[PDB]
């Protein structure tokens, strides 16, 4: 029952060649659904469930508000450069916004910004004031206290953003809840007296996966090295887990895959071989 919503903005000075300077991406439970770039200047749907449940009037309003923030983030790059006394080069203004509906029923809303990687400003819900991390972020709080932008942000993070997220889950009930079985491949490579056993999982949904190596039916978590969960072009995920072993012991090793699509943890061997062993 844990549902997440995130709208990530990026304002860049150096994109560089043939790339957009302003990029705004929207997410529902990790899955991409909203996209915006400074070149196209339009808010377009990425997945099928949003376009089927929303009209053009929705996307027309979604374009103008991000187009307005694009102009605000354009001047923000110049205001922040003068505070640090910088002529120009590579400077980035990042933004994080959205709500997290917990399994119990508690609402958690976030709204924060960062300059050149390091934290700049963050909004506090239990105080209704903007928190400044760096000494250069002090004039930002003075601007927020003058206009009173915190009041409009409070009603958004507590109601507007929450009400829409509840609908997004209902709209993509079939896509987000669907499980995808991964194609497992077990490999091995000999270098200098050591055999490097590799295990790859191809195309799986959702993102959480536990891929661990076994020796004689016993887990070797320390000896196994993982590359992390990497995403594919179609929306699916990939994972790479490697282990070092002595030559003539490769067949004694087994790859364990724990996924939502599988009822029990799938055990795969090199000579078996891999996912095609049924």
């Amino acid at each position: 029952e844990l549902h997440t919503l995130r709208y990530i903005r990026t304002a860049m000075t150096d994109p560089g060649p043939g790339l957009p300077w302003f990029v705004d991406v929207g997410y529902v439970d990790g899955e991409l659904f909203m996209h915006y770039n400074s070149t196209a200047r339009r808010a377009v749907p990425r997945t099928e469930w949003i376009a089927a449940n929303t009209d053009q009037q929705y996307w027309d309003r979604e374009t103008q508000i991000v187009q307005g923030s694009e102009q605000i983030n354009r001047e923000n790059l110049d205001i922040l450069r003068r505070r640090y006394n910088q002529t120009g080069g590579s400077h980035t203004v990042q933004w994080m916004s959205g709500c997290d509906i917990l399994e119990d029923g508690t609402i958690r809303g976030y709204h924060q910004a960062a300059y050149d990687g390091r934290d700049f400003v963050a909004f506090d819900k239990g105080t209704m004031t903007l928190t400044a991390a760096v000494p250069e972020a002090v004039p930002t709080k003075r601007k927020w206290e003058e206009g009173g932008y915190a009041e409009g942000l409070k009603q958004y993070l507590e109601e507007t953003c929450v009400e829409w997220l509840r609908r997004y889950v209902e709209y993509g009930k079939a896509e987000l809840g669907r499980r995808e079985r991964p194609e497992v491949r077990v490999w091995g490579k000999e270098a200098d007296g050591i055999l490097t056993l590799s295990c790859r999982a191809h195309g799986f949904y959702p993102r959480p996966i536990v891929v661990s190596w076994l020796k004689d039916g016993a887990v070797r978590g320390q000896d196994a090295q993982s590359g992390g969960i990497v995403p594919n072009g179609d929306g699916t995920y990939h994972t790479w887990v490697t282990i070092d072993a002595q030559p003539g012991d490769g067949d004694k090793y087994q790859c364990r895959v724990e996924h939502a699509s599988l009822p029990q943890p799938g055990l795969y061997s090199w000579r078996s071989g891999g996912g095609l062993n049924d």
């Binding site: 808010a43 979604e62 307005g68 923030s69 910004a113």
Partner: peptide, 10 residues
């Protein structure tokens, strides 16, 4: 929905 342009002023 995306937040209003007003909440991005620095």
């Amino acid at each position: 929905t995306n937040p209003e342009s007003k909440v991005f002023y620095l």
